[PDB]
Amino acid sequence: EVKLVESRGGLVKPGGSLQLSCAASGFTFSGYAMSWFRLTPEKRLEWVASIYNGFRIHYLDSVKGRFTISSDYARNILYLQMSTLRSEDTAMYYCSRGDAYSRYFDVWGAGTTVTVSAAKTTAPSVYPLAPVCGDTTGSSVTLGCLVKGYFPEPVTLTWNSGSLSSGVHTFPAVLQSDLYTLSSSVTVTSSTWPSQSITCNVAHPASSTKVDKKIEP
Amino acid sequence: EVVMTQSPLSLPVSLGDQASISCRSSQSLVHSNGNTYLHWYLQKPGQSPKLLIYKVSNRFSGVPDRFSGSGSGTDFTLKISRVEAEDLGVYFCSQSTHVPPLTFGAGTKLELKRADAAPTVSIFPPSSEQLTSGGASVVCFLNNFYPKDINVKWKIDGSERQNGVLNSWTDQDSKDSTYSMSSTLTLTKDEYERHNSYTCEATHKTSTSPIVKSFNRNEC
Ligand SMILES: N[C@]1(C(=O)c2ccccc2)[C@@H]2CC[C@@H](C2)[C@H]1c1ccccc1
Ligand SMILES: [O-]
């Protein structure tokens, strides 16, 4: 078929450099405005740069002088050389081919994650969240798990090793002190807990750590 | 730079309903060559953007006829004749008339409607383990509510507390169409042991007054 095969992204420190790339599959760049776009952490879609027929090259102001877009029209591979990387450059990057005649983008590469941070691999601290006194009552009770201070993303969290899948809400991670923090809640009938056990299981592949925390009154 | 403004930011609909999304530019998108380079894209979670309509009203190959575009100059509209589950996601308009730079609207999230639901609020004190490390995070969950709009307020010993609060929101639940929120107030162990009354209050359209949950530290 017709597609764009993207390269792996990566983690880099501020001021560092990194190169992304996409190989055409089923077509040639000849005639297209090959470009790069990015979805920011705030969820805004931004155009980054484009290169048309070798010389029509354009850049977003914020990246002029730091990012260089280039193309190997012989091998049909698009490149984005990122240098002087800043924290604000953290985002999901996508390469896409722009029709030079209608100016739309039909073929897109899968998103490539780029993270700019000074943080070093750090395993999370997993804290159990037990209900306050007088709230363990009611027809149902809610327990929680706080996963704090880890890097980089992601972590995988389950309750009772997956047996407890319903009534769970695991929230998106947020940054604080350059490290990620996430939380998860699980709601069960007051009958179950505490008599029965409820455990929070957190895996963080980056640090090869697997932590289990039982929620006790 | 041309600014693209989309309205609404969130569009709740019921499956089978008609949907209409607006996009307006700060300047006419009519190029000097006579063309209007205004386009519509749809992006779903964990997926790349997909082209739906180009040059205002040209439906791209493979795109269902349920989608249609219109408008001119500074105002444009994307319409969906009959919304299907597969259509849920974020719709972006983009202009490529005045470039560089190409610019996009902030997007319109197409979501599902359901009956109103008050949030179930639960508060949690710092754990023994975290306190041993010198930290003290108080957590409050505001779960399964609808509509998505909600506000949380923290109070320490009765006074509003804005510093040290971090929030997180889930996407609309794929099973019950509700939303949930997590709010965490982080203090140092020192500060936590300096006060006693901790409170989280939720303001939602399902109640005139906020839903309050609280606890006293010295009680645990
Ligand atoms: N000026 C172009 C360009 O490469 C371009 C790309 C990004 C920003 C500014 C200009 C070339 C001539 C017609 C096409 C190709 C146009 C273009 C504009 C916008 C999107 C795609 C293609
Ligand atoms: O160009």
Q: Which ligand is nearest to the CA of A35?
A: 1
Q: In chain A, which residue's Cα lies nearest the Cα of B143?
A: A169
Signed CA dihedral, A58, A60, A66, A71: sign only: negative
Distance between CA atoms of residues B196 and B176, nearest Å: 37
Q: Which residues are CB-contacts of B209 (< 8 A; sequence separation ≥ 6)? A: none
Q: Are B53 and B63 in contact (CB under 8 A)?
A: yes
Expressed in Å, this structure's resolution amounts to 1.8
Domain boundary among A118, A151, A175: A118
Q: Which of A43, A174, A187 sits opposite B168 (nearest CB)?
A: A174
- Asked if residue A104 and residue A152 are part of one domain, the reply reads no
- C-beta atoms of A105 and B139 within 8 A: no
Q: With b meaning 16 or more CB within 10 Å and e meaning fewer, what string describes A32-60?
A: bbbbbbbbeeeeebbbbbbbbeeeeebbb
Q: Are residues A129 and A85 in the same domain?
A: no
One domain, residues A144 and A109:
no
Q: Do A130 and A216 contact (CB within 8 A), yes or no? A: yes
Binning chain B into helix, strand and coil, the percentages to the nearest 5 are: 5, 50, 45
Taking phi over 0 as left and psi of -120 to 50 as alpha, with beta for the rest, B81 belongs to alpha
What is the three-class DSSP state of A198?
coil
Here the tokens at position A151 are 């890097």
Q: Which residue of A has its CA nearest to B94?
A: A104
- The alpha-carbon radius of gyration of chain B (Å, integer) is 23
Residue A83: domain span:
1-118
**Ligand 2 centroid distance, CA of A150 (Å):** 44
CA neighbours closer than 13 Å in the CB half-sphere of residue B210: 15
d(CA A79, CA A39): 18
CATH code of A112's domain: 2.60.40.10
Q: Which residues in chain A touch residue B92, judged by CB atoms under 8 angstroms apart?
A: 45
Residues A82 and A125 in one domain: no
Q: Is the CB of A56 under 6 A from ligand 2?
A: yes
Q: Does A132 share its domain with A90?
A: no
Cis peptide before A131 (omega within 30 of 0): no
* CA angle, residues B116, B121, B127, in degrees to nearest 5: 155
Structural domain count, chain A: 2
With a CB cutoff of 8 Å and minimum separation 6, the contacts of A51 are A33, A34, A35, A57, A58, A69, A70, A71, A78
**Across the interface, which of B37, B48, B182 has its CB nearest the CB of A94?**
B48
Q: Are residues A19 and A3 in the same domain?
A: yes
Q: What is the CATH number of domain B116-215?
A: 2.60.40.10
Beta bridge partners of B198: B156, B215
- Assigned fold of B1-114: Immunoglobulin-like (2.60.40)
| Residue A169: closest CA among B2, B179, B45 | B179
Are residue A155 and residue A194 in the same domain, yes or no? yes
Six-digit token string for A89: 């450059």
Residue B191 parent element (H or E): helix B189-192
Q: Degrees (nearest 5) of the Cα angle A73, B49, A175?
A: 105
Could you tell me if A130 and A114 lie in one domain? no
Coil, strand or helix: which one is A181? Answer: strand
| CA–CA gap between residue A145 and residue A136 (Å, rounded) | 16
Experiment used for this model: X-ray
Secondary structure of residue B63 in the 3-state scheme? coil
Residue A205: which of A150, A159, A165, A127 has the closest Cα? Answer: A150
Closest Cβ–Cβ partner in A43, A132, A185 for B143: A185
CA distance B102 to B38: 11
Question: Cβ neighbours of residue A42 under 8 Å, at least 6 residues apart?
Answer: none
> For chain A, what is the radius of gyration of the CA atoms?
23
Distances in Å between the alpha carbon of A128 and those of A47, B8, B169?
42, 39, 20
Say which residue the tokens 């750090």 belong to.
A122
Give the residue carrying structure tokens 């704090």: A148
CATH 2.60.40.10 residue spans of chain B:
1-114, 116-215
Rounded to 5 degrees, φ, ψ at B87 are -80, -10
For residue B34, what are the contacts with CB-CB under 8 A and spacing of at least 6? none
Give A148→chain B minimum CA distance, Å.
10
Breaks (C-N over 2.5 A) in chain A follow: none
* Per-residue tokens: B212: 């309050």
Residues 6+ apart with CB under 8 A from B161: B154, B155, B185
